[PDB]
Design a protein around this ligand. Structure first.
Ligand SMILES: CC1(C)CC(=O)C(c2ccc(Oc3nc4ccc(Cl)cc4s3)cc2)=C(O)C1
Ligand SMILES: CC1(C)CC(=O)C(c2ccc(Oc3nc4ccc(Cl)cc4s3)cc2)=C(O)C1
Lengths: 424, 426
């Protein structure tokens, strides 16, 4: 049997023996079926790469729309398996229109049922935009378009595995389990470098927070790498993680990372998935020709996403959080559910010696040049006695509690469990 | 620093004699007031450029938040006049937090009351992000916003900035009603504004202004950003409408990353405030970035599908010359539940131009033809292909065009469709 065969591909994706076709098999270029994924009733459709390379026509598009209507009616997740050059040119405008009706069904489903895309072959034209309307896109390598793909699998079978796990993440979200959170506690601070001025990969921190046995399904790892986002489980419960990555661009927010974070916040908010926000950000960067327009418009989008978000969202400041980027990374002013800080964390407008160079610029400029640097360091040292540090932030009220890093998991879980499912 | 005085700036913006302070003056760096704009009750606040460069502190940010809370309770438009270097560094984290609370209030108001920003001087730091959270940003030339597309409207000077800000309050809050008599009195032969050759480029803006009322400004948004797409507010027989139109003068009128984003953002803004849409379509395809990066047009194009697909205000489409392929679907097509789709009699609706199409469908037959005959053969196949496909008659049979119209009735045909539509759904 040809590897591209759509029944074979659906049967690989679904639970063995669960497949039930929604229509008679035909030459339309699409096969749609009901099935189960680890017990969850799921709808899926597959483009038929053996017929016209999978090109989309009126009758195949109608099968996809019918499957979307079936899935919306029963509130089931819907998975598309994509292998297709686009609309059938020979069918003309009728095919364009039917492709648009596929788009309109995905839009009607948006935020209502989870939509997973598994791209296992070449996907072009209308078949590139279809997956782009869904919530998570898994790409097998055998299938520039930066940002569009969320997860790169190893091969086709591995792509179905990741797709199946995503169905579980969205449809078997579970409950937080305080006792499982405690059993997984470790000293996560031990993963930071000894010098607070050295850069590190944030991913080990993220996996130490998340459940030891569950994978971290990172989204868009190679796009906007100063920001890490993805799905995992915290004490058995599906959570979303966003974390500045000091390893790239100093961990700074820029236009792409703000957009990556905002899109992920909106996805999690839409499906009731709470957020853990691991903050270690020193500032924000401009474009390339130094145009601030992108980070301003995309940064505003990030502000908008957190401000409107109603799922529980808890912030953990590990080391630094400065300036405008501090506000954007789920701050109390944007109604963060709770803000935690590790003991050595600094919450400030900017570095002390940068801040002193502005606040005392005239005094410093009026001092003899041979004794200016010694006065700058003295005023900086006095500035840190008052500004920064957790207790200043605690007194202000922008941090709710300083926590022992050995209790990060149970503190985060406790805060997420106490919040309502909605409002913030 | 008298000319930057907040009470005077507020008074120059509001109707003469309507200003009523919402708190007593101080040196917080913000003055907030209630007023009227051509009669409409309006809330406004002015950063005080005469106090510490307008730098934002806890006290001033608190006046702004109370101004927003007042405007939200009364469902009044709220106008910010911006001249500020950012948060007061000496207040430390407390000022950051208060600036954040200003952001949070703008977010609560989002889509609920119109928010207009008039940037009359420098606006930097948090005072750059404030305007970016609002619906329309008017910028006076003696000004800059720093820390494109952020600025919607560029005025001639500070006073012009207030005039344009005042007109925007009118467009959002005195939307009016459609008037069949005034629509027909304004009918002209819009098609005559096209070139004679269907291959020549042209500025779409005279077509737009000929649809809109002759006595009323077309307030184009972001004219110098994503120039293949034109968007803005004007009036159609007195009724506020939003316009989207591919501009063939730039990039052949193609869609691309930033034109998709320009269009999507503008669609969601009109839809939020009940403003019907006119979509003037003449689009031959879509484009990647110069690096051949498609991820922008895919991501932003999907967001434009979403914006039209979810849109519930009346939205009517006019095909002037041509609309092709995926760009066809995205430009308020029947498949995204456009209210009504109109076409001029010679318009083309097709997957692609006929020559391109038969060049693919009959690649082998053309490659086999003798070089000096492979062209006459191409034109023969292309004319056979457009006998059966691409015309308005065929689009009417299919059902993706609702009506072929006389271009001399464009303006009154669009008005009729928008006026008789449900205010919500589609
Ligand atoms: C022979 C073809 C390549 C012709 C053709 O054009 C398509 C096609 C159909 C639907 C598409 O879907 C969207 N295209 C855009 C473009 C811009 C924006 Cl802003 C949004 C969207 S959505 C995209 C391509 C085909 O499949 C076959
Ligand atoms: C001297 C200053 C205190 C002046 C000042 O006011 C600010 C400032 C304050 C708030 C800001 O607001 C936002 N910044 C970002 C960045 C990224 C993203 Cl994604 C979203 C947002 S929102 C921006 C700058 C400073 O840093 C230094």
């Amino acid at each position: 049997l040809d590897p591209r065969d759509p029944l074979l591909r659906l049967s690989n994706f679904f639970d063995d023996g669960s497949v039930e076709l929604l229509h008679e098999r035909d030459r339309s270029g699409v096969l749609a079926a009901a099935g189960t994924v680890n017990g969850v009733r799921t709808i899926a459709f597959c483009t038929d790469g053996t017929v016209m390379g999978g090109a989309m026509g009126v009758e195949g598009c109608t099968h996809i729309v019918n499957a979307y209507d079936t899935a919306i009616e029963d509130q089931s997740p819907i998975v598309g398996i994509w292998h297709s050059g686009g609309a059938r040119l020979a069918e003309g405008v009728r095919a364009l229109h039917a492709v648009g009706q596929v788009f309109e069904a995905m839009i009607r489903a948006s935020g209502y049922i989870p939509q997973i895309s598994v791209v296992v072959g070449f996907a072009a034209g209308g078949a590139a935009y279809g997956p782009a309307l869904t919530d998570v896109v898994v790409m097998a390598p055998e299938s520039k378009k930066s940002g569009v793909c969320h997860i790169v699998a190893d091969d086709e079978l591995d792509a179905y595995d990741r797709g199946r796990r995503l169905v579980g993440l969205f449809c078997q979200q579970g409950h937080f389990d305080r006792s499982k959170a405690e059993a997984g506690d470790t000293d996560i601070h031990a993963l930071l470098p000894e010098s607070s001025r050295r850069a590190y990969d944030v991913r080990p921190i993220v996996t130490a927070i998340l459940d030891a046995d569950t994978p971290f399904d990172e989204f868009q790892a190679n796009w906007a790498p100063s920001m890490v986002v993805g799905l995992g489980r915290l004490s058995g419960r599906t959570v979303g993680v966003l974390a500045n990555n000091p390893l790239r661009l100093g961990g700074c927010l820029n236009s792409e990372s703000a957009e990556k974070a905002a899109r992920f916040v909106r996805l999690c908010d839409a499906f009731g998935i709470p957020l853990v926000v691991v903050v270690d950000v020193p500032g924000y960067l401009p474009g390339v020709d130094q145009e601030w327009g992108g980070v301003v418009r995309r940064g505003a989008k990030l502000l908008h996403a957190f401000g409107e978000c109603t799922v529980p969202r808890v912030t953990l400041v590990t080391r630094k959080t400065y300036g405008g980027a501090y506000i954007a990374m789920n701050s109390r002013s944007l109604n963060a559910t709770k803000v935690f800080a590790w003991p050595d964390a600094e919450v400030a407008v900017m570095g002390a010696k940068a801040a002193v160079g502005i606040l005392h610029k005239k005094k410093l400029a009026a001092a003899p040049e041979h004794e200016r640097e010694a006065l700058h360091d003295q005023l900086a040292a006095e500035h840190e006695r008052i500004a920064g540090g957790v207790d200043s932030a605690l007194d202000i009220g922008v941090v709710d509690e300083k926590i022992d890093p050995a209790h990060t998991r149970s503190k985060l879980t406790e805060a997420l469990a106490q919040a309502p499912a909605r409002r913030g």
